[model samples]
Target: GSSGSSGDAVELFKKANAMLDEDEDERVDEAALRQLTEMGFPENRATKALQLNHMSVPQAMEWLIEHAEDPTIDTPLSGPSSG
Candidate 1:
């Protein structure tokens, strides 16, 4: 969620985008997907995270990092082959 802190919706949007947009019904951007995957997240999970967060790299990164501990998660917390 909000991390128990407060940020206006606009601020949140800005922060999320600062890390990485889109057409309606859009697919993930190649650049963001590639970057995330290179950072060691699996393609499927990275795609889902990107979609879930409207392609916001920061948001997706946060979500992926948090969920890294989940048994079902496929990405490593950090490494060359989390993907």
Candidate 2:
């Protein structure tokens, strides 16, 4: 089961588009995702982080980095392909 902090693909897509519609700046864009990935964030992690933060890339990246240091937040016990 996904926790409240865990965001699904649906959330990422819908919310991100909505934010893009409202605020053109700092509203989570492709560039934001690219930047987060370049910062060493995994694809799924960065995607979910952005969604969970209501599509605020800056906040998402900030929170993701902090939570990643520990597994208690939204960080999964196993990675995307872990068995």
Lowest lDDT sum, 10 consecutive residues, model 1, at 11-20
Candidate 1, after superposition: displacement of residue 80 in Å? Answer: 18
What TM-score does model 2 achieve against the real structure?
0.46
Q: Tell me the whole-model lDDT of each prediction, alpha carbons only.
A: 0.71, 0.66
Model 1 has an lDDT value of 0.71
Give the range where candidate 2 is weakest over 10 consecutive residues by summed lDDT.
16-25
RMSD per candidate (Å) reads 9.9, 15.9
In the range 1-83, model 1's lDDT, one tens digit per residue, is 54655764654433444421452366776677787898888788878878876765667888888876766765445667745
Measured with C-alpha atoms, the lDDT of residue 72 in candidate 2 is 46
Most accurate candidate by TM-score: 1
